[PDB]
Write a protein that binds this ligand. Structure first.
Ligand code: XJ8
Length: 238
């Protein structure tokens, strides 16, 4: 996160850090608890990942320093990537992780509500992007979970800023015209969380952008409301 500040412990209890153990253990991506056995994240996080056996999901983490060999984690039983996904910049950048065991909810770890199709008209003015990513395009993973308040922009405005791309209605953008605050490398897969009427909703999934926090280059997020039917379909038992 560029231009952000340290989070308070427990203030983003749906935020997880997804690790890979290969070749040695490191943070791979953010993600969001959306159900007792389900993390919502970005499809691009699994580039080159051949098996869910190398993944570990840590919840209730503020500092990466909390994670040691003796720290408990959730195994991943299944990675579910949208079947239309090709790459982050052309959309469908959404994935579900089915955990091997269930999360026991507490104030350190609990789910975020998915948006309602009826909330498509709501004007959110209290949106935050969070993660352990770079503070600048050339940087490194941060110890403490960072947060930044960023305004949503219209898809028409976002499209003007990305003329070589197609910004679809299945994407949503956020950023300041002057730049300065944004997601960056290592933040992808995490939430864009918007508070409205005292309730948090998972509005976006951190997906891509041109550089980090640049002037007139909004962050691009997966527009989660467009995938509520997909999420229901994929999280249904078989
Ligand atoms: N406004 C935005 C939003 C997202 C942006 C992204 C997202 N990509 C990303 O966040 C990419 C995604 C990725 C995942 C797996 C394989 C390849 C790429 N992630 C990373 O580049 C990434 C992830 C985990 C890491 N852990 C480490 O220990 C050290 C790293 O250097 C490291 C880098 C990148 C650049 C600008 C952005 N601007």
């Amino acid at each position: 996160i560029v231009g952000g500040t340290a989070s308070v412990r427990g203030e983003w209890p749906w935020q997880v850090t997804l690790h890979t153990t290969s070749p040695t253990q490191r943070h791979l991506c953010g993600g969001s608890i959306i159900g007792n056995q389900w993390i919502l994240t970005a499809a691009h996080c699994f580039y080159g990942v051949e098996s869910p056996k190398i993944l570990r999901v840590y919840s209730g983490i503020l500092n990466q320093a909390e994670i040691a060999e003796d720290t408990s984690f959730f195994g991943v039983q299944e990675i579910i990537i949208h079947d239309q996904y090709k790459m982050a910049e052309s959309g469908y950048d959404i994935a579900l992780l089915k955990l091997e065991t269930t999360v026991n909810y507490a104030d350190s770890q609990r789910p975020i509500s998915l948006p309602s199709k009826g909330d498509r008209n709501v004007i959110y003015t209290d949106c935050w992007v969070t993660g352990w990513g770079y503070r600048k395009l050339r940087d490194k993973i941060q110890n403490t979970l960072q947060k930044a308040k960023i305004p949503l922009v219209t898809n028409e405005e976002c499209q003007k800023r990305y003329r070589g791309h197609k910004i679809t209605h299945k994407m949503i953008c956020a950023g300041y015209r002057e730049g300065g605050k944004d997601a960056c490398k290592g933040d992808s897969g995490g939430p864009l969380s918007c508070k409205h009427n005292e309730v948090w909703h998972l509005v976006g999934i951190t997906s891509w952008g041109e550089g980090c926090a640049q002037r007139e280059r909004p962050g691009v997020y997966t527009n989660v409301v467009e995938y509520v039917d997909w999420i229901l379909e994929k999280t249904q038992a078989v």
